Amino acid sequence: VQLQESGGGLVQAGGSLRLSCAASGTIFGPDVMGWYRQAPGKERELVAGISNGANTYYADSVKGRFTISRDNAKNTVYLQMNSLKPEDTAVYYCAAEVLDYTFAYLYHAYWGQGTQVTVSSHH
Amino acid sequence: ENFMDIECFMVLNPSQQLAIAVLSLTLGTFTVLENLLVLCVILHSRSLRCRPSYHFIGSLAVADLLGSVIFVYSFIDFHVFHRKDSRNVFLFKLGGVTASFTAKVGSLFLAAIDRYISIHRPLAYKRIVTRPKAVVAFCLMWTIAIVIAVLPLLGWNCEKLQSVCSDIFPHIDKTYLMFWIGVVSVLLLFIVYAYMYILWKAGIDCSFWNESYLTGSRDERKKSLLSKFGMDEGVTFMFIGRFDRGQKGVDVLLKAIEILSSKKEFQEMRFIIIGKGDPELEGWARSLEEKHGNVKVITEMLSREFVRELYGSVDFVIIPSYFEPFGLVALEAMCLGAIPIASAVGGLRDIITNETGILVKAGDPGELANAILKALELSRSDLSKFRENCKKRAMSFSDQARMDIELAKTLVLILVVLIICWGPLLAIMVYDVFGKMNKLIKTVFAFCSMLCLLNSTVNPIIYALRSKDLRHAFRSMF
Ligand SMILES: C[C@H](NC(=O)C(C)(C)Oc1ccc(C(F)(F)F)cn1)[C@@H](Cc1ccc(Cl)cc1)c1cccc(C#N)c1
């Protein structure tokens, strides 16, 4: 499968931002979509996750601020954040998991290129 | 030169024209009225029309109409009204019959595709195929069947080409007949192979997590498994998943093991941890394995059967998942009689009820510690009721797959009755396009040509015998 990001860029503190990750596969593409973030000098961590509908999960530090959605017309995932905080400066990746129904231990994880997002307190 | 002239193909005794005519009328009217009944039932019911998986039935019924009316009207256009048939009306009738057969084949094709999606890719059936995709696919199927039916009218007839001309049907050539029979035959062969593959693969995959594949009782299986790991008999806990932070809370499990390490009941506990991932978590698990003699960590890839045995032997399964969308691990554990201790989040919130297993909050090692202590306390009594209830619930979530398999079996029955009814006719068409064409084969063709109308008769009969929902809709109509 092929994964592409869009919407990265700098934004002032307390603003809003959107990222869109598009996947290209053979059958339904990804099964579980997610966003991971990696701060400099800090290992990657899972910011948000989704499978379909209202079956979402958000990291405990970003609950009530971030939101995630999926679209089947173009088979993409949209991440919206509002009221940015200056510790959110990180490189963001969209992760796609294809898991087999017959035996749950097998799974395939695909990582995209990622985009750099910097939060500045002042303009 | 004339459509449906029985005397041309065989000499019929003049004592039974009336019997043949009245039998044809009763069969044709029965087919038409029962097909309109099927359309009325499938269209007047909200439950059936909102389900894409039943759409093929309506399509088949429409095809069952197209081959039926064109039959009985062609009896009216010849016997009771002695008007002859021109080239255009004869080609129209032939196109109607061929369109009916091609639409039946294409409907079976779309049904087979839908069956494969619904059975062998259940996580994608809900979101790939919906109303617009299914209705568009059926529309293109019907239009392509229509255009291959109409091609001889556009100038692909015997008259315009002035080439070698078919004997079993006038006004058409051998090339168009060969093309149509070839595409129909290759499509039908693909359908047979696809349905055989679907019914074969789903036979072993669906009925795989049952306890019937394990030999011996639970206690001796657990004893043998623990002796394989060099541990004494005790209450066994199992974790299988992914070594990472954020997706599966294996670090929560390790913190819980560290907390229980300070208590006096830790020596009764046995822990098995299986996974692969971050080297830090793997090293942490290896350090706990080296420290305590009742903790086993497996990192290398395991086979499906081995994990089947493990569910069969352990007493509890810990699923401290932060974000578990589907809860497949819980389903596989409860299918093999293992009590799940899972975080109350995602599908694990509603797969496991308060009676089947134990639910904790996400990300709290203390709550997991108290849950494991409560599980050890419950292990003092008999857990057979928990095993049977978990097995019943896990089998209850698998009811959709069995109904899908039953629908696939009904489709296989429709396909095989189609093949049986259209076998000899298609073979006779092969003999016509390839080789000589004598009078005896003409008589055989005339005899077996009623099998198409018999096939249209028997297609909606088996819907009542198989489709319970169609029967419910029909009863609600009355
Ligand atoms: C019944 C038609 N058979 C015939 O016309 C020939 C081949 C002349 O032999 C028969 C067969 C039966 C009858 C009778 F007595 F029942 F009316 C009369 N003639 C057959 C003609 C036919 C045309 C194309 C194909 Cl591929 C197959 C059969 C047809 C006519 C209309 C609808 C359907 C279906 N439903 C089938």
Numbering used by the authors:
A (entry chain N): 2 to 124
B (entry chain R): 100 to 301, 1001 to 1196, 333 to 412
Copy text from the publication.
The cannabinoid receptor 1 (CB1R) is the most highly expressed GPCR in the human brain, and broadly regulates synaptic neurotransmission through retrograde signaling. The peripherally restricted CB1R inverse agonists MRI-1867 and MRI-1891 represent a new generation of compounds that retain the metabolic benefits of CB1R inhibitors while sparing the negative psychiatric effects. To understand the mechanism of binding and inhibition of CB1R by peripherally restricted antagonists, we developed a nanobody/fusion protein strategy for high-resolution cryo-EM structure determination of the GPCR inactive state, and used this method to determine structures of CB1R bound to either MRI-1867 or MRI-1891. Instead, the complex of CB1R-5M-PGS with CNB36 shows that the nanobody wedges between the PGS and the receptor’s intracellular surface and makes contacts with both components.
